[model samples]
Target: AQHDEAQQNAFYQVLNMPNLNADQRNGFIQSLKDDPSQSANVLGEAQKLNDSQAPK
Candidate 1:
């Protein structure tokens, strides 16, 4: 598969999030690999997840 390194790096940021379990991480990575077009949505999701975990 010809994957974009930039996009992969973005996805890696999401993968590094501490909130996701193994299943969620694997599933997300698989889905991203399956559809790179969803990178924006995935990054948006990551932002939300990050915000929820941030200190007040």
Candidate 2:
């Protein structure tokens, strides 16, 4: 199955946050490309990581 680069780019935007390092960011993106099934959970995980760094 072919994946959407546009959608993947969107995912990259969400995944690109202060919480993740360069390697981690690319890793997650690559994983998403490999398995789209995990896309949802991966995005959520990215958000969770970002939320944890949120300043109160």
Candidate 3:
């Protein structure tokens, strides 16, 4: 699957976030790969939780 530059950057940004653990980070990457169309929403949802809160 292919993503726009913005989406790709967002994905990278998500990766850089200190909040997510390995699992959450991998999950986000999988979500992005699984739904390239919803990359923005996926990342948005993931970002809803700050570094302190674990991703659900």
Candidate 4:
């Protein structure tokens, strides 16, 4: 399968979040591992989590 640059970027975004707890981080990784095609949606979930957080 072709690599998804946007999904890859999103993956790194989640991976690089220093504030992510173990469950969040692992969920992000598992999403990608489970299906690259679904990774962007998984990352969307991560982004939604970020958006829902109180501003730091």
Candidate 5:
């Protein structure tokens, strides 16, 4: 638990989309540098999509 908390202090490895507008992407990326929760929220959404698409 402690290690995970520590990891949250760093970048959450947020992925970038080429089709997204530069300003929008930059805003989120900059927010991630200060608020890791933002990154986790985004990744969590993607994880849910993956799980839904996986074979049962």
Candidate 6:
């Protein structure tokens, strides 16, 4: 199965919301875990977005 980068990226956009709560974060992680071909970089990118809004 082939996954589109743009589509995967789109998922990343929503799941990566900076304000994501525990459910949201875990849900996002589950989504990635469910996807058979997702890579570390891809997951990392999503995490990056998830934390983008964190107070620095």
CA lDDT scores, all candidates in order:
0.72, 0.70, 0.77, 0.75, 0.49, 0.62
- How do the predictions measure up, each by TM-score? 0.63, 0.59, 0.75, 0.68, 0.41, 0.41
Give me candidate 1's TM-score against the actual structure.
0.63
TM-score of 5: 0.41
Worst 10 residues of 6 by lDDT: 36-45
Clashes of each: 0, 0, 0, 0, 0, 0
Candidate 6 lDDT, tens digit per residue, 1-56? Answer: 25777656656565657666777666666766676356454566556756775777
For model 3, state the Cα shift of residue 38 in Å: 0.3
Candidate 3 residues 1-56, lDDT tens each? 35568777878877887777788888888888788888888778678644558554
lDDT of 5 by residue, 1-56 (tens): 23575344333332433334456445555766566556666454434544565566
Ranking by TM-score: 3, 4, 1, 2, 5, 6
Lowest lDDT sum, 10 consecutive residues, model 2, at 1-10
**TM-score leader:** 3
Give residue 23's error in model 1 in angstroms.
0.5
Residue lDDT tens for model 4, 1-56: 35567866867888876666779878888877788878778777877776666367
Which residue pairs overlap in candidate 6's backbone?
Answer: none
Top candidate by lDDT: 3
Task: Name the candidate, 1 or 2, with the larger TM-score value.
Answer: 1
Q: Which parts of model 1 are misplaced by more than 4 Å?
A: 1-5, 47-56
Error of model 4, residue 40, in angstroms = 1.3
lDDT for model 4, please: 0.75
What ranking of all candidate models by lDDT puts the best one first?
Answer: 3, 4, 1, 2, 6, 5
Winner of 2 and 3 under TM-score:
3
